[PDB]
């Protein structure tokens, strides 16, 4: 309904508090990250795609109830967020391509929502010139427009409006004899029009992003804005719920079954390696110990678990208390943070501390070879079509979507109903299903 | 060629000042041009003789924790180098054997300096660098990468009929 579409131009000249500056950037990253996931898991013209994207847009407050024209809260949030997020993604070329790609899907979706009458006003308020024609002229040149149209079968000329644009602006259409031309003007339907609009927006955005990276030295001096420029996708999750603290009740005699039914693949492999060799290296110990803390183990239970597992390795009981109890006791407590007290997230597992030979930590979908991953999935009692889907997803660098598919097929459901970005979240959603 | 250590940042100035303090005869013999009055500079004093500083050339050619003569011998030459503190120099004048130690130490440093130059091949390398760039040998021994390559570009533009920038100051 509303005029939420904008060609992002004329940077804001306002001033904002630091809290709003951080919140807008985080929210925009969340929105753009979920647009890509929706695009990967679905197609652009289904009911599910539209419904989920619209619900998410409602949730993040980027289009909602009205206000006095200028300080329209969602419009203002959208504008400031876009221009803030340009700085983060201007640096690298791979980041630039990602930002350009994801910022056009949202514009396509928003243009798909406009009513049939507001498009002309939006176009006129846009760059310089787009015009529509009345039904009289449309019927006057109906046959010629139909003949000039491409090889699309039949004479189905519905009620969709037809726009007249200067021929040069429709270059990519008229050099192939795919539009009707009359006195320097081309008559175009809606689909090619939105294609032209998207191409122009892409060109302008690419120009602006290329220009922004030039003048970047002027913000890097700010100490408050260093977490924005460098680390908006690095190792901290965009928004995380499964954290330290929390409540839970887990019995020690049940971990064997929850390993088969509830644990994600990474924790499954760590648990198997620990139960087989009676030992784990430093990375595996940290990852699996933090995971076990997240799901509801207590200090006494953790000490008992690790001690009872490490005695079978033919060591002296007292050596454990002398050397390994200290780290476990340190983990559950006070300061020394950011790697020692917070359970690992999916992004941190994926993009940091790659395993070596003899190491069983990391993400299976990322560090395992496709053949080895295939054999791993076969031992998991997975249907061959599921392996074909998962390996296809993995090849496209979408590891977490592959893990989502694994969750769905293991629990025998069509859709998980969530976006996975943390192993503890994988355990919690699995326990919720029961 | 005169080889020394910390010549360009100490000994050359001290020597030139002590020469005119006691009014030594014919200071100009330090150079190659007969001159009457001396300036108050150092590079102009010894015209005709190129001075090689082992401290300056070591930085360009090798990486060390410090570029003192004691540390230079330890890394390049692999040999200890004892030091005499400047406070003790007075107390070595009271006996013949002690004052021969001071003379012996002085002689050894001169041979140590000559050894570091030959191992690093400073002299053959200076000739080759100068011939490629096309500048004055005394200037490349003093130091300064920019001055050397400036002459390389200057030669290139001249042979291709160009107007070159005037020297700035």
């Amino acid at each position: 309904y509303p005029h939420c579409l904008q060609f992002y131009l004329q940077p804001p000249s306002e001033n904002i508090s630091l809290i709003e500056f951080e919140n807008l950037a985080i929210d925009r990253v969340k929105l753009l990250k979920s647009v890509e996931n929706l695009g990967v898991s679905y197609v652009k013209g289904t009911e599910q795609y539209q419904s989920k994207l619209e619900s998410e847009l409602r949730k993040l407050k980027f289009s909602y109830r009205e206000n006095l024209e200028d300080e329209y809260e969602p419009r203002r949030r959208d504008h400031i967020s876009h221009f803030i997020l340009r700085l983060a993604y201007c640096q690298s070329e791979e980041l630039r391509r990602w930002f350009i790609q994801q910022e056009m899907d949202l514009l396509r979706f928003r243009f798909s929502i406009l009513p049939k009458d507001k498009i002309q006003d939006f176009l006129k308020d846009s760059q310089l010139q787009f015009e529509a024609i009345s039904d009289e002229e449309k019927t006057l040149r109906e046959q010629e427009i139909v003949a000039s149209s491409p090889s699309l079968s039949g004479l189905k000329l519905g009620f969709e409006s037809i726009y007249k644009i200067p021929f040069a602006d429709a270059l990519d259409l008229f050099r192939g004899r795919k539009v009707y031309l009359e006195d320097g003007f081309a008559y175009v339907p809606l689909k090619d029009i939105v294609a032209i609009i998207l191409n122009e927006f892409r060109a302008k955005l690419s120009k602006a992003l290329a220009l922004t990276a030039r003048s970047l030295p002027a913000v890097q001096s700010d100490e408050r804005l260093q977490p924005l420029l460098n680390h908006l996708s690095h190792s901290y999750t965009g928004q995380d719920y499964s954290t330290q603290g929390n409540v839970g009740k887990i019995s020690l005699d049940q971990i064997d079954l929850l390993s088969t039914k509830s644990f994600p693949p990474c924790m499954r492999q760590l648990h198997k390696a620990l139960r087989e060799n009676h030992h784990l290296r430093h990375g595996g110990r940290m990852q699996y110990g933090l995971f076990l803390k997240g799901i509801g183990l207590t200090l006494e239970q953790a000490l008992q678990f690790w001690k009872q597992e490490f005695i079978k390795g033919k060591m002296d009981p007292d050596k454990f208390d002398k050397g390994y109890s200290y780290n476990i006791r340190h983990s559950f407590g006070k300061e020394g943070k950011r790697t020692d007290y917070t359970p690992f997230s999916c992004l941190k597992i994926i993009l940091s501390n790659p395993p070596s030979q003899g190491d069983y930590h990391g993400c299976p979908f990322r560090h395992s070879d496709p053949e080895l991953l295939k054999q791993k999935l076969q031992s998991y009692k997975i249907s061959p079509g599921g392996i074909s889907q998962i390996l296809d997803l993995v090849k496209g660098t979408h590891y977490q979507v592959a893990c989502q598919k694994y969750f769905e097929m293991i629990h025998n459901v069509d859709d998980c109903g969530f976006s996975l970005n943390h192993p503890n979240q994988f355990f919690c959603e699995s326990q919720r299903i029961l | 060629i005169i080889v020394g250590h910390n010549i360009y940042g100490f000994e050359l100035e001290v020597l030139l000042q002590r020469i005119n303090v006691c009014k030594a005869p014919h200071w100009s013999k330090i150079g190659r041009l007969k001159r009457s009055n001396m300036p108050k500079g150092e590079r102009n004093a010894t015209c005709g003789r190129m001075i090689c500083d082992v401290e300056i050339s070591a930085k360009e050619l090798i990486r060390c924790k410090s570029y003192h003569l004691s540390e230079l011998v330890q890394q390049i030459l692999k040999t200890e180098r004892v030091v005499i503190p400047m406070e003790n120099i007075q107390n070595m004048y009271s006996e013949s054997s002690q004052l021969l130690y001071l003379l012996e130490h002085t002689w050894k440093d001169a041979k140590f300096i000559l050894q570091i130059m030959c191992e690093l091949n400073v002299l053959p390398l200076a000739l080759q660098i100068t011939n490629i760039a096309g500048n004055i040998m005394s200037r490349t021994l003093m130091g300064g990468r920019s001055e050397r390559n400036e002459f390389l570009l200057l030669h290139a533009f001249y042979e291709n009929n160009y107007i070159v920038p005037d020297k700035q100051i």
């Binding site: 400031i80 690298s92 408050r224 901290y236 430093h282 002398k322 300061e335 020394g336 790697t339 | -």
Partner: protein, 464 residues
């Protein structure tokens, strides 16, 4: 671009500066390392034509502290597979010469185990085992007395030191001068130990000569000083970079230090790369104000006091059981005390104390040097380190946001889980009169936060 390519082939870039790149390979076969190295060569040289990378060397082990500050095992390749590993250190010299024999002996052991060829789990176990024993030995007095002697050289006459009282070696030299015969002068060295007198004086003022240690009975060696101020700095400067080891952990191995030690721990050192209200406001100082009637000190850390059913506004009843005065009545005094508490932190920030980042230096100064390194001001005591503010602007900003947060009843009510409990107490304690009282205390902290401190961000300067 090069960094992106290397991380795509499952390799880690641990440093790179404009003429060098350090790459972690996770490989143990040297033949594979060169094969892996030549693959990076072709990858970069595929996109460009003239720029070419070249192999420089191989390290079998590394301890990356900073640029030109590391301990590594360089590989010197012999014929056909075999090599010789050479110990190589740079930038690991301590400027101070006032360390005891026990501290220097411990320091060489830790560096010695690091440059071994064993795995990480073996190194940490050996280091932890030794440090556990050392703490035990010190407490039982099994260490010889001569191990604790410290020697420092005077540069001036003792009566010309401005810091006088805060310098342990000057304090002893003053006692030597006035008590007996021979007189110390500039250039002389002084030997001293730190003992317990029962006089509560500072560790700088409890310095005694070694002779007086056995000659006198009422004094004994201060084990707390040597464990925390002598042993810990030397070990921590090497073992902190190791993953899984933290400065608080070393203290735990050595005694009953950790809780007190973590108060003396740092705040910026944890910055390796939003946060919750519980973890964001954990180093901020609680608001304290005595009761005008009974005098008992009151602690304010949240809007509500208690948990579950019996949770009430913190400003409802006095903490003293015998006192029946409501702090909500005494609102003017609370607001006045707030203002007094904020000028304290603003003045503390503007003091300008800088402290060196090196654990063995820790130079404290209020004078900002005009010689800057790449990171910040360059320390004038040890010429290779950067000074850092003792109280940063982020700590001052977070402190004022904490005062605004313990009096914000508006935001503390939407934070409640169930909509039924929020209604039950809003009609019970939070009368419209009560809501107005919290608004006056909240606006006191907001005046100081309003336009100052750059909680504000200027977008006009940021984009244009």
């Amino acid at each position: 671009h090069t960094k992106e390519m290397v991380q795509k082939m499952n390799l880690e870039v641990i440093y790179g500066d404009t003429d060098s790149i350090m790459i972690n390979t996770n490989s143990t076969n040297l033949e594979e390392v060169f094969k892996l190295g030549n693959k990076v060569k072709s990858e970069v040289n595929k996109l460009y034509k003239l720029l070419e990378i070249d192999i420089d060397g191989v390290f079998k082990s590394l301890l990356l502290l900073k640029k030109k500050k590391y301990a590594a095992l360089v590989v010197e390749p012999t014929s056909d597979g075999n090599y010789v590993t050479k110990q190589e250190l740079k930038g690991l010299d301590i400027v101070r010469r006032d360390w005891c024999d026990l501290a220097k002996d411990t320091g060489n052991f830790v560096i010695g185990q690091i440059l071994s060829d064993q795995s990480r789990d073996t190194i940490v176990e050996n280091i932890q085992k030794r440090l556990i024993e050392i703490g035990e030995n010190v407490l039982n007095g099994s260490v010889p007395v001569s191990q604790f002697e410290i020697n420092k050289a005077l540069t001036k006459d003792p009566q010309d030191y401005p810091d006088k009282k805060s310098l342990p070696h000057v304090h002893v030299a003053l006692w030597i001068n006035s008590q007996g015969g021979r007189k110390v002068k500039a250039g002389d060295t002084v030997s001293y130990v730190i003992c317990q007198d029962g006089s509560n004086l500072t560790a700088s003022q409890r310095a005694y000569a070694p002779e007086q240690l056995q000659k006198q009975d009422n004094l004994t060696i201060d084990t707390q000083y040597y464990l925390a101020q002598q042993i810990h700095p030397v070990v921590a400067r090497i073992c902190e970079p190791i993953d899984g080891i933290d400065a608080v952990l070393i203290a735990t191995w050595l005694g009953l230090d950790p809780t007190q030690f973590r108060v003396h721990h740092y705040h910026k050192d944890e910055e390796n790369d939003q946060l919750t209200d519980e973890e964001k406001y954990r180093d901020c100082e609680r608001f304290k104000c005595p009761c005008p009637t009974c005098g008992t000190e009151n602690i304010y850390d949240n809007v509500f006091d208690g948990s579950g059913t019996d949770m009430e506004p913190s400003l409802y009843r006095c903490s003293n059981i015998d006192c029946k005065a409501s702090p909500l009545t005494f609102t003017v005094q609370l607001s006045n005390k707030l203002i007094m508490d904020i000028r304290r932190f603003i003045k503390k920030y503007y003091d300008g104390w800088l402290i060196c980042e090196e654990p063995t230096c820790r130079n404290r100064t209020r004078h900002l040097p005009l010689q800057f390194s790449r990171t910040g001001p360059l320390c004038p005591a040890c010429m290779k380190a950067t000074l850092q503010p003792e109280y940063s602007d982020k700590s001052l900003y977070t402190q004022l946001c904490f005062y605004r947060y313990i009096f914000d009843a508006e935001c503390a009510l939407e934070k409640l889980t169930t909509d039924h409990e929020k209604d039950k107490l809003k009609k019970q304690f939070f009368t419209p009169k009560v809501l107005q009282d919290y608004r006056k205390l909240k606006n006191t902290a907001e005046q100081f936060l309003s336009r100052s401190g750059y909680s504000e961000v200027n977008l006009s300067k940021l984009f244009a």
